[PDB]
Amino acid sequence: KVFGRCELAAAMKRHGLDNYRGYSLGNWVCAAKFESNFNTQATNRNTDGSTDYGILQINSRWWCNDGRTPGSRNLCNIPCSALLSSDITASVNCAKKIVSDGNGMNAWVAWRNRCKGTDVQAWIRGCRL
Template sequence: MRMLAVVALLNLVLVASEAITLEPCALALELTFWRMSGYLGYTLADWLCIVHHVSDFSIQPPLSKTAEKAYGIFGFSNKYWCSDGVQPSRNYCNISCEKFLDDDIQDDVLCARRVLTRNEGAQTWPQWAEKCRGKDLSSYLKDCKL
C-alpha cells in the first residue's frame, strides 16, 4: 500500500512539472476573445511573435539560476511585473508570479496590457523589437481559422 502511495505521488510531481504548450492558433483565438487584436495598435501576429520568441508557447516554471526569472507565456519578470515571494519586486501587475504558470491566460493578458500602458509599448519585450517589429508576421496566422 505504501509503495502505491509513493508511485501516485511521483506521478503527480512528474505531471505537475511538465510544461503546458499552447497551440498558436488556439492562443490567437483566446487573444481575440480578450480583445488583444488591435490593442494599442498591436496585431494578433505581434502577440504570437512575442510569445514565440519569449516562451515558445510554453508555460513552465522558470529555469533561470539567477534571482530574476521570467514567468508565463509573456515572460513577466519577477523583478518588475509579479511577485514570487523571493526576489524583491515592484509587482506592477499586483499578482503572484505563480498565476502565470497555468493555461488560464486572463491574468497574463491583463498584465500584458499593463506592460504596454506603463512602459514604451511592446518595446518592453526586447524580443519583439528585435524579431517582430516591422517584419512580415503573416506566417504566425496563416493556418489559423479565426
C-alpha cells in the same frame, strides 16, 4: 500547457489582445513564440535574480510577486505563479498593463529583436479567428 499557434491566436483574441495598444494579433503570437515557444509553464532566471514567467515571460522585477526578487514591485497585483496557468487570463491582463507603460512592445526584448518590423501576420496566417 503548450499552445498551438492558431489556438493561442484565438485565446489572445478572446481576451482582447488583438490590436491592443495598436499591436495586431500576429505581434502577440510572435512575441509568445520567441519568449516561451507557446509554453505557459516557461520560466527563466535573469542574472539580477528576477525571474520571467509564462507565455509572455513577464518579469518579477516589476510585474508580479515571487517573494525572491529584492526591491521588486508587483504592479499586476498577482503571484508570478498565476502567469504559469493553462488559462492565459492573468498573463493577458498583465501584458496589457506592460504594453501601456510607455515603450509599447519594446518591453519584450525578444519582440524587439525577432518580431518588430517583420511580417508578423504570418503568425496568424490560416487561423480561423
